[PDB]
Design a protein around this ligand. Structure first.
Ligand SMILES: Nc1ncnc2c1ncn2[C@@H]1O[C@H](COP(=O)(O)OP(=O)(O)OP(=O)(O)O)[C@@H](O)[C@H]1O
Ligand SMILES: Nc1ncnc2c1ncn2[C@@H]1O[C@H](COP(=O)(O)OP(=O)(O)OP(=O)(O)O)[C@@H](O)[C@H]1O
Ligand SMILES: Nc1ncnc2c1ncn2[C@@H]1O[C@H](COP(=O)(O)OP(=O)(O)OP(=O)(O)O)[C@@H](O)[C@H]1O
Ligand SMILES: Nc1ncnc2c1ncn2[C@@H]1O[C@H](COP(=O)(O)OP(=O)(O)OP(=O)(O)O)[C@@H](O)[C@H]1O
Ligand SMILES: Nc1ncnc2c1ncn2[C@@H]1O[C@H](COP(=O)(O)OP(=O)(O)OP(=O)(O)O)[C@@H](O)[C@H]1O
Ligand SMILES: Nc1ncnc2c1ncn2[C@@H]1O[C@H](COP(=O)(O)OP(=O)(O)OP(=O)(O)O)[C@@H](O)[C@H]1O
Ligand code: MOO
Ligand code: MOO
Ligand code: MOO
Ligand SMILES: [Mg+2]
Ligand SMILES: [Mg+2]
Ligand SMILES: [Mg+2]
Ligand SMILES: [Mo]
Ligand SMILES: [Mo]
Ligand SMILES: [Mo]
Ligand SMILES: [Mo]
Ligand SMILES: [Mo]
Ligand SMILES: [Mo]
Lengths: 268, 244, 244, 268, 244, 268
């Protein structure tokens, strides 16, 4: 490889050309925010539950940002499910539902951000940054809405009109594209089980699992949006994620401290 | 299946590398587009072309990830849209931004016969990882929009006659056989370069409305006009949506 | 009195709780709106409905003030506007944002026969204190706009026949008598729930143009059409603007 | 009361229902920026007067932000009165005049902000925040335009087309909705008098007064936009305001120090 | 030379000091504009007038540089545009922002017969140094746009009959002789006040399309109408673009 | 002079009146960011060259911002030249090309900004500020796109459709209008020579020169956009500029330290 060979391919071939694709893969790898952790605060699993769930997590965020740089993305939750149901019954496409769901994640970011405002932590928006570098350097944390920006360009699922890339995917992709050191999903269960613990009696807790093992166990679509597992296997920077129960006091703090609470899901 | 939001819409994607040829290609295309305005309701979307290769060269040299390169490339498609729209301004045509395309296309096509936008989708820093080259590019964005709208068609205007079995400008040009018709699934099972994004084939697999997309040579006046009337003058790609 | 900016405009406010019924209510309403497009120049404004009650539930549990809840509710009305506009997209109808409604409505209604916007006013963190529930909601915003424009009318499309003496779906449903006609001042002197914002009655007291607002049942096809022709098919609210 | 009883009312009743209204009133009360002070710098009374008035207040802002978190909103002044006169003579409605007046308050915020830029203090905009939490945490102050965002949805006065909610109301409502600890109006008189001190010989200074007492004295429309007095009586967080003379050196500094310069107007 | 983007466009710049006269001047002008809508495709641009002098007074007293004063003045021209557009709203006319004028004027003039914008150019903090007074003001911005578009004309609507040899309202009013016709180069070589920006003469020297600009008295009904038909009712300024 | 005489002229005369122009010239002169240095990073000369040029300058920016407040504007480079060639061949006007060139300078600002994000340095945008005061106070640096905002209102050159005010002019005007203490152009040559050093054998290096001397030597259009030289002669605040070679390690650092590397061009 060389810069000249890569630039020659880049000028003379289609971007679909395997030779170009392979030369581009040898490029150096810059991590934009390598010291930051992305955390997703679930909409249905946390913010929809109101004060009993949100206030302890606010306290943890405030305590954590002393020693940890945090990008805190919000899920959407039951109001997005309602919008999806109205729009799906009208026959509207996934690209229309994608924008409806984003508004709900924005509401949740605004609510969480207003509880954090007096600690200096802003809500930031965009399909990328602007306000992120300065806020991370000065107050060590920002809040963002977790939904991807695809809008009408959302890729539909194989079946149905529910957007397949929602706030798990949105937060994961940001962690991946910023080259963050860690991705923590904050939900309302201790982690992954062998079956849905809300609808099954004797599901067994899984501390650690690979994406391939999850698929073989029929857990492709369980505690994470299933497309996130495929994104994870393709990722360059974030090759494992941790799922923790934000309803347990101090669980986020302990996860940020390196404690293996919850489930660690690995790309391989 | 979902309803068709704009069933009367015709979407036309202009290759960035067609625009790169400058006036020699753009002026005939502009005159052909002018004549099409009274015949169709057009969303014209521009790809990126060679300038995006240059910013990929710089960005990759700087180590930047694929979520950083995607909006850098989308910018070049946007610039091509501003150029093309300026050429059709006296016919009432303007460039419109992505949020406007996404949410207000109906009122804009009520005001005027055609608008121009960027064919790239706004995946930006949420582009998928895997390749260091942004996968969801101009063909893919144009198809996502056209299918989401339930448009009457998507025509891809290329600098070659259509899809061949090899790059007809590449090292293996001598083996390159023209494909008058193919399916997205057949193309997806091949390895080798194409004139359309590989991701285009993936979104065709999940498409809900568009049954076929024709790739035609915009360097041959009249092929776009014939294609918009369903005449077979390039490569037809069957998406695998089944007709009624 | 102030001039009428858009004297030929008809403003129609669609209740958020009508939208909440989904396709069963929205599809007939969309077909009725389609048939009205050639008859009137329409600004269609959507309320918020049940999702705003949920975000009030969460927001109040978190302690948030009324200036925080107001834009959270306005978001749901905006989402209802995007949904309704998508259903009328093939007729040239799009959702337009508040700044566009405020400053560019005339050009948009020149481009197309109707546009959709959010009925909530952008009071946002400058909502008035007093109640923990945002007072200036969808009815109030729609009336403020309609009267500011000097529009030919404002019709409020409800999930009930009009205003009753009690909530016709509430604990006292049995005592609820239909009011075919009332005045804003008479309604304001009553205590008890209404299907319209209490703040609507206050802005009616200072209104400059709109003399009457009809509340009609959007669940009965044809009532909106009849109301826009001045036929009395719901509750007429006299604002206390006097005619010439 | 309970969350469940409130949520049941919220689902099943109109928001106009008195029972719902009463249950919502029992909700907890979160103050978003409880340590901040909102200050309004008058347009006609201060900024229109140019350097002799503005430069000393810039010095006070710079000195004050060491020990005080400040949100500094600007009034509009004579250019807004000119726009109101042109638009009123054309018959334009209050909602149109509201936007015209906002542009003037924006001009004043930009001028004041450029004098403060080298001290790190930004101009921020919006019907709420975004840039406020981070700026308050880092440089202890922000400048904003004082006009409310109501635009064409401005409620008209009972008579005439002048918007009744202007920059006094805009700044007050922000103080109230952020739950700030203090609201200081910076004008060009020492405080409230029993009559307009510019047009009356022997008006008497009033150090402290309630809104009800002001109305009984015929001072409803005097040194503050009269709608502000009604907003004040409805407020949850800011139940008194202080009016001070910004033309007196150090008056803002002393007010921020707890000195009772000027007039304190109380909701009750 | 560059192509003409909007060759059928007529640009009309309304002096800020005309607007400053209020209804007595604005109502006749609005009625004349109303009657012109079916005859021309109009971009109407407003200057700033006396309020910009006040903000210059305050800003200069505060020491602010010319890049700070320029957008403060542009704001007043914007406010004049909102006022004038509101008066023509019932004819379908709205104010449009600078980015919309720059990139989407063609679609807006397809939707409606005229739009209003701010005549000031967005030089903002990149205004040129030299004078403490922003040099690129309403006349200059309107001409830059009109010439960039290749518009059919630019008419400047003043509160005086045209250009005189001295300020006809100033200390030397008695010596002031009316100039029915002049060239930009002749005006540029004079010292003394003009009713048009000095920078207007500089951009006329580099103009590519507009051959003449007429300054007419908007206080005399009918002069704008006659000027837009090429009748000589004010001062013609020859730009030094040569005809074919 | 006096404020009253100036305000009287401002009300009663055209702004073209020489007497008004002269009274305005006597106004006090406020510098908005007097301690800041504006630096332009060339597009063709630096950023287009990729890592070997950009990474050392990133290191210098990071080290410099400890003791220096920096506004770092980006040039455009070869992609803008390509856009200009396509648009010029179509007959499009300078005002259309101006916007095309700005997009390229924006791309370069985004690339540079992402290399600086982990050091807290943001990309900021606008025909002025917003984010500049806070970022300068907190992280001592910001990145911005260098192209002026003139868009379709770009003044054309006397001949041809290439916009004459590009990123040299954009950065210079910002330095001038903010009253910055220093303007450094970072290019790919040690400074000004008596002829183009890339196309001439024995050009002689010029450490220091005035704009008038440059014009007399036929160097009007050499290492800086020629309109910048005229802007420089009109400037109130920035009356000299320094051109340095950013490809020489530490050259920017040494220029910021007061070392006379490169060429100093003086207004007089
Ligand atoms: N095998 C499993 N192990 C653990 N949880 C599971 C499993 N299968 C399904 N789940 C469910 O997944 C849920 C977490 O996903 P959910 O979408 O509720 O979270 P969220 O991030 O809050 O969503 P949003 O943010 O979109 O509202 C759990 O509440 C749990 O009931
Ligand atoms: N199998 C193939 N059949 C036809 N053309 C091919 C094939 N493989 C590669 N190509 C090349 O693709 C070129 C078109 O390049 P590309 O598709 O990148 O341009 P574009 O579509 O104009 O750009 P953009 O995607 O930015 O709009 C053709 O000229 C041809 O050389
Ligand atoms: N006096 C009354 N007369 C009629 N309906 C009433 C009365 N009091 C309460 N209601 C209730 O108001 C309901 C309508 O609720 P609401 O007005 O909140 O919905 P909406 O107007 O669709 O919502 P939004 O204000 O978000 O647009 C009716 O179905 C009825 O049960
Ligand atoms: N009883 C009173 N006591 C004190 N001042 C009074 C009284 N009645 C009227 N005023 C007038 O109110 C003025 C303060 O209100 P004014 O609107 O000028 O201030 P402002 O906040 O600068 O306005 P804006 O910001 O809208 O320009 C004083 O200058 C004073 O002349
Ligand atoms: N040589 C001149 N010929 C004619 N009028 C002149 C001359 N010199 C000065 N003037 C003055 O210019 C005045 C017009 O002022 P000006 O041009 O500033 O207003 P405007 O063009 O309405 O404002 P704006 O530039 O903000 O749109 C005339 O009324 C006249 O008094
Ligand atoms: N007399 C001269 N001395 C030094 N350099 C000169 C001279 N004349 C021409 N140049 C050229 O000017 C170039 C610097 O200007 P150039 O436009 O390349 O820089 P830039 O700021 O990177 O441009 P952009 O940012 O617009 O891409 C040098 O690379 C050099 O070849
Ligand atoms: O971009 Mo437009 O043309 O009215 O919304
Ligand atoms: O929102 Mo728009 O302004 O359809 O031309
Ligand atoms: O500003 Mo608009 O873009 O009327 O469609
Ligand atoms: Mg292609
Ligand atoms: Mg209702
Ligand atoms: Mg003039
Ligand atoms: Mo937009
Ligand atoms: Mo927008
Ligand atoms: Mo907008
Ligand atoms: Mo906008
Ligand atoms: Mo805009
Ligand atoms: Mo926009």
């Amino acid at each position: 490889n060389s810069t000249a060979e890569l630039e020659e391919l880049l000028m003379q071939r289609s971007l679909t050309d395997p030779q170009l694709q392979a030369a581009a893969a040898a490029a150096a790898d810059f991590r934009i925010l390598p010291d930051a952790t992305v955390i997703k605060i679930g909409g249905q699993s946390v913010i929809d539950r109101g004060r009993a769930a949100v206030y302890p997590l606010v306290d943890e965020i405030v305590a954590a940002r002393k020693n940890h740089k945090l990008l805190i993305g919000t899920g959407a939750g039951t109001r997005a499910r309602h919008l999806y149901s109205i729009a799906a019954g009208l026959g509207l496409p996934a690209g229309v539902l994608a924008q409806l769901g984003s508004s709900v994640a924005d509401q949740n970011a605004a609510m969480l951000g207003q509880l954090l405002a007096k600690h200096g932590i802003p809500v930031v928006g965009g399909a990328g940054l602007s306000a992120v570098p300065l806020s991370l350097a000065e107050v060590n944390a920002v809040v963002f809405s977790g939904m991807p920006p695809y809008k009408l360009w959302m890729r539909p699922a194989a079946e149905g009109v529910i957007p397949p890339y929602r706030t798990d995917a949105g937060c994961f992709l940001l962690a991946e594209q910023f080259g963050c050191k860690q991705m923590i999903f904050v939900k309302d269960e201790d982690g992954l089980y062998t079956a849905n613990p809300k609808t099954s009696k004797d599901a067994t807790f899984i501390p650690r699992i690979s994406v391939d093992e999850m698929k073989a166990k029929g857990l492709h679509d369980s505690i994470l949006e299933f497309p996130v597992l495929d994104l994870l296997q393709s990722a360059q920077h974030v090759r494992e994620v941790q799922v923790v129960n934000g309803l347990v006091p101090g669980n986020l703090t302990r996860a940020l401290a390196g404690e293996h609470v919850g489930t660690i899901i690995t790309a391989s | 299946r979902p309803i068709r939001l704009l069933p009367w819409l015709q979407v036309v994607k202009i290759g960035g590398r067609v625009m790169d040829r400058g006036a020699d290609a753009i002026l005939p295309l502009v005159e052909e587009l002018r004549k099409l305005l009274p015949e169709h309701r057009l969303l014209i979307l521009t790809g990126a072309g060679v300038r995006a290769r240059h910013v990929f060269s710089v960005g990759l040299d700087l180590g930047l990830p694929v979520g950083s390169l995607a909006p850098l490339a989308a910018s070049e498609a946007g610039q091509n849209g501003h150029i093309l729209a300026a050429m059709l301004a006296s016919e009432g045509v303007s460039y419109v931004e992505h949020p406007t395309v996404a949410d207000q296309l109906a009122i804009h096509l009520s005001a005027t016969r055609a608008v121009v936008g960027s064919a790239f989708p706004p995946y930006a820093h949420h582009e998928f990882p895997g390749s260091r080259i942004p996968p969801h590019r101009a063909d893919t964005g144009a198809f996502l929009l056209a299918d989401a709208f339930g448009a009457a068609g998507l025509t891809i205007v290329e600098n070659v006659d259509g899809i061949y079995t090899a790059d007809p400008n590449g090292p293996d040009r001598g083996q390159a056989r023209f494909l008058p018709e193919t399916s997205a699934t057949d193309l997806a099972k091949s390895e080798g370069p194409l004139p359309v994004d590989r991701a285009l084939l993936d979104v065709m697999a999940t498409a809900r409305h568009i049954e076929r997309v024709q790739v035609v040579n915009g360097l041959v006046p009249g092929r776009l006009t014939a294609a918009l009337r369903g005449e077979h003058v390039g490569t037809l790609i069957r998406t695998g949506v089944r007709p009624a």
